[PDB]
Structure 1
Amino acid sequence: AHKSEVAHRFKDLGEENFKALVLIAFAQYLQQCPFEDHVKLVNEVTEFAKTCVADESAENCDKSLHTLFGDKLCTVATLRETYGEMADCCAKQEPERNECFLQHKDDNPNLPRLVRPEVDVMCTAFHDNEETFLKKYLYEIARRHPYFYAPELLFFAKRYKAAFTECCQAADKAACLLPKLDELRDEGKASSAKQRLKCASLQKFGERAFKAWAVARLSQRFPKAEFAEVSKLVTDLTKVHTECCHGDLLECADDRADLAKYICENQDSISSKLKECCEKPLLEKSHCIAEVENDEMPADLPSLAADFVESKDVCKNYAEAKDVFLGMFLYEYARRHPDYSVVLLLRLAKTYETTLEKCCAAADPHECYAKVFDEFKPLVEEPQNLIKQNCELFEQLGEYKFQNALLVRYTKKVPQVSTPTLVEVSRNLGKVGSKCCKHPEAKRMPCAEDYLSVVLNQLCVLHEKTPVSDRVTKCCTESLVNRRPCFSALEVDETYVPKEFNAETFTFHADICTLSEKERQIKKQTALVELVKHKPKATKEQLKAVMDDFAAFVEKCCKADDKETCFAEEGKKLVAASQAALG
Structure 2
Amino acid sequence: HKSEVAHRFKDLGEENFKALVLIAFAQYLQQCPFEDHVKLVNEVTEFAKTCVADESAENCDKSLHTLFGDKLCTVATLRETYGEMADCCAKQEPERNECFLQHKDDNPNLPRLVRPEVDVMCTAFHDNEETFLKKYLYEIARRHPYFYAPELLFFAKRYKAAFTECCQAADKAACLLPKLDELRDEGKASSAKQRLKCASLQKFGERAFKAWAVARLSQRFPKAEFAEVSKLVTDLTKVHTECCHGDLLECADDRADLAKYICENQDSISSKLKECCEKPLLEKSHCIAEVENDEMPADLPSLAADFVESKDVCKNYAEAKDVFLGMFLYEYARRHPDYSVVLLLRLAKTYETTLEKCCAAADPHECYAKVFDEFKPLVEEPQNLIKQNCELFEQLGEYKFQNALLVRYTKKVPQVSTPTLVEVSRNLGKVGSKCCKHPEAKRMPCAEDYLSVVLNQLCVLHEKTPVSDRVTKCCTESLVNRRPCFSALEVDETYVPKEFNAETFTFHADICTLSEKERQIKKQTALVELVKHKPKATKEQLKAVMDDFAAFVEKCCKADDKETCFAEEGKKLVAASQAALG
- Report the TM-score range of the alignment, normalised by the length of the smaller protein: over 0.9
Provide the secondary structure at the position in 2 that maps to 1:276. helix
1:268 equivalenced with 2:267 (yes/no):
yes
1:181 equivalenced with 2:180 (yes/no):
yes
Following superposition, the deviation at residue 581 of structure 1 comes to 2.7
Q: Which residue of 1 aligns with 2:103?
A: 104
Provide the secondary structure at the position in 1 that maps to 2:40. helix
CA spacing shift, 1:513–1:55, aligned 2, 3 Å: farther
Structure 2 unpaired stretches of 5+: none
Provide the secondary structure at the position in 2 that maps to 1:557. helix
Q: Deviations over 1:504-550 (max 9, x none)?
A: 32222223223232233222211211111122111112211221222
CA spacing shift, 1:564–1:50, aligned 2, 3 Å: farther
Q: Deviations over 1:448-497 (max 9, x none)?
A: 11111110001111111110000110101111211110000000112211
Following superposition, the deviation at residue 572 of structure 1 comes to 3.5
Provide the secondary structure at the position in 1 that maps to 2:143. coil
Following superposition, the deviation at residue 582 of structure 1 comes to 2.1
Q: Deviations over 1:281-337 (max 9, x none)?
A: 111011111011111001221111111111131111111111111111111111111
Following superposition, the deviation at residue 579 of structure 1 comes to 2.3
Following superposition, the deviation at residue 51 of structure 1 comes to 1.5
Q: Deviations over 1:202-225 (max 9, x none)?
A: 111111111111111111110111
RMSD: 1.3
- Choose 503-512 or 28-37, whichever is displaced more: 503-512
- Choose 73-82 or 475-484, whichever is displaced more: 73-82
Report the Cα distance in structure 1 between the residues aligned to 2:549 and 2:28, rounded to whole angstroms. 50
Q: Which residue of 2 aligns with 1:198?
A: 197
Following superposition, the deviation at residue 381 of structure 1 comes to 0.9
Report the Cα distance in structure 1 between the residues aligned to 2:143 and 2:570, rounded to whole angstroms. 41
CA spacing shift, 1:469–1:273, aligned 2, 3 Å: same
Report the Cα distance in structure 2 between the residues aligned to 1:531 and 1:105, rounded to whole angstroms. 44
Report the Cα distance in structure 2 between the residues aligned to 1:350 and 1:148, rounded to whole angstroms. 33
Following superposition, the deviation at residue 179 of structure 1 comes to 1.6
Report the Cα distance in structure 2 between the residues aligned to 1:172 and 1:106, rounded to whole angstroms. 40
- Choose 339-348 or 540-549, whichever is displaced more: 540-549
Provide the secondary structure at the position in 1 that maps to 2:274. coil
Provide the secondary structure at the position in 2 that maps to 1:60. coil
- Choose 260-269 or 88-97, whichever is displaced more: 88-97
Following superposition, the deviation at residue 122 of structure 1 comes to 1.7
Following superposition, the deviation at residue 123 of structure 1 comes to 1.6
Following superposition, the deviation at residue 268 of structure 1 comes to 1.0
Following superposition, the deviation at residue 3 of structure 1 comes to 1.5
Report the Cα distance in structure 2 between the residues aligned to 1:464 and 1:103, rounded to whole angstroms. 23
Provide the secondary structure at the position in 2 that maps to 1:504. helix
Provide the secondary structure at the position in 2 that maps to 1:52. helix
Equivalent residues in 2 for 1:168-567 (5 A)? 168-567=167-566
CA spacing shift, 1:3–1:345, aligned 2, 3 Å: same
Provide the secondary structure at the position in 2 that maps to 1:379. helix
Report the Cα distance in structure 1 between the residues aligned to 2:436 and 2:265, rounded to whole angstroms. 35
Report the Cα distance in structure 2 between the residues aligned to 1:405 and 1:562, rounded to whole angstroms. 33
Report the Cα distance in structure 2 between the residues aligned to 1:516 and 1:141, rounded to whole angstroms. 27
- Choose 459-468 or 541-550, whichever is displaced more: 541-550
Report the Cα distance in structure 2 between the residues aligned to 1:390 and 1:159, rounded to whole angstroms. 33
Report the Cα distance in structure 2 between the residues aligned to 1:548 and 1:150, rounded to whole angstroms. 50
Provide the secondary structure at the position in 2 that maps to 1:377. helix
Report the Cα distance in structure 2 between the residues aligned to 1:271 and 1:25, rounded to whole angstroms. 34
Following superposition, the deviation at residue 108 of structure 1 comes to 2.0
Following superposition, the deviation at residue 400 of structure 1 comes to 0.9
CA spacing shift, 1:339–1:496, aligned 2, 3 Å: same
Q: Which ranges of 4 or more aligned residues in structure 1 deviate by more than 4 Å?
A: none
Following superposition, the deviation at residue 138 of structure 1 comes to 1.0
CA spacing shift, 1:120–1:559, aligned 2, 3 Å: farther
CA spacing shift, 1:317–1:294, aligned 2, 3 Å: same
Q: Deviations over 1:393-435 (max 9, x none)?
A: 1011111111111011011101111111111111011111111
Report the Cα distance in structure 2 between the residues aligned to 1:374 and 1:260, rounded to whole angstroms. 40
Report the Cα distance in structure 1 between the residues aligned to 2:517 and 2:68, rounded to whole angstroms. 43
Following superposition, the deviation at residue 124 of structure 1 comes to 1.8
Q: Deviations over 1:222-275 (max 9, x none)?
A: 011111111111111111111111101011000000000000000111001101
CA spacing shift, 1:127–1:562, aligned 2, 3 Å: farther
Q: Deviations over 1:169-208 (max 9, x none)?
A: 2222212222221111111111111111111111111111
Provide the secondary structure at the position in 1 that maps to 2:31. coil
Following superposition, the deviation at residue 561 of structure 1 comes to 4.2
Provide the secondary structure at the position in 2 that maps to 1:186. helix
CA spacing shift, 1:36–1:198, aligned 2, 3 Å: same
Q: Deviations over 1:360-411 (max 9, x none)?
A: 1223211211111111111111111110001001011111111111011011
Following superposition, the deviation at residue 34 of structure 1 comes to 1.2
Provide the secondary structure at the position in 2 that maps to 1:245. helix
Among all aligned residue pairs of Structure 1 and Structure 2, give the percentage whose two residues are the same amino acid: 100
- Choose 573-582 or 372-381, whichever is displaced more: 573-582
Following superposition, the deviation at residue 16 of structure 1 comes to 1.1
Report the Cα distance in structure 1 between the residues aligned to 2:22 and 2:227, rounded to whole angstroms. 42
Following superposition, the deviation at residue 59 of structure 1 comes to 1.4
- Choose 565-574 or 318-327, whichever is displaced more: 565-574
Report how many residues are paired: 582
CA spacing shift, 1:425–1:121, aligned 2, 3 Å: same
Equivalent residues in 2 for 1:61-100 (5 A)? 61-100=60-99
- Choose 71-80 or 422-431, whichever is displaced more: 71-80
Following superposition, the deviation at residue 157 of structure 1 comes to 1.3
Report the Cα distance in structure 2 between the residues aligned to 1:283 and 1:486, rounded to whole angstroms. 40
Report the Cα distance in structure 2 between the residues aligned to 1:19 and 1:73, rounded to whole angstroms. 16
CA spacing shift, 1:171–1:561, aligned 2, 3 Å: farther
Report the Cα distance in structure 1 between the residues aligned to 2:224 and 2:113, rounded to whole angstroms. 46
Following superposition, the deviation at residue 13 of structure 1 comes to 1.1
Q: Deviations over 1:3-52 (max 9, x none)?
A: 21111111111111111111111111111111111111112211221111
Structure 1 unpaired stretches of 5+: none
CA spacing shift, 1:517–1:48, aligned 2, 3 Å: farther
Report the Cα distance in structure 1 between the residues aligned to 2:129 and 2:515, rounded to whole angstroms. 27
Following superposition, the deviation at residue 558 of structure 1 comes to 2.3
Following superposition, the deviation at residue 277 of structure 1 comes to 0.2
- Choose 404-413 or 111-120, whichever is displaced more: 111-120
Following superposition, the deviation at residue 142 of structure 1 comes to 1.1
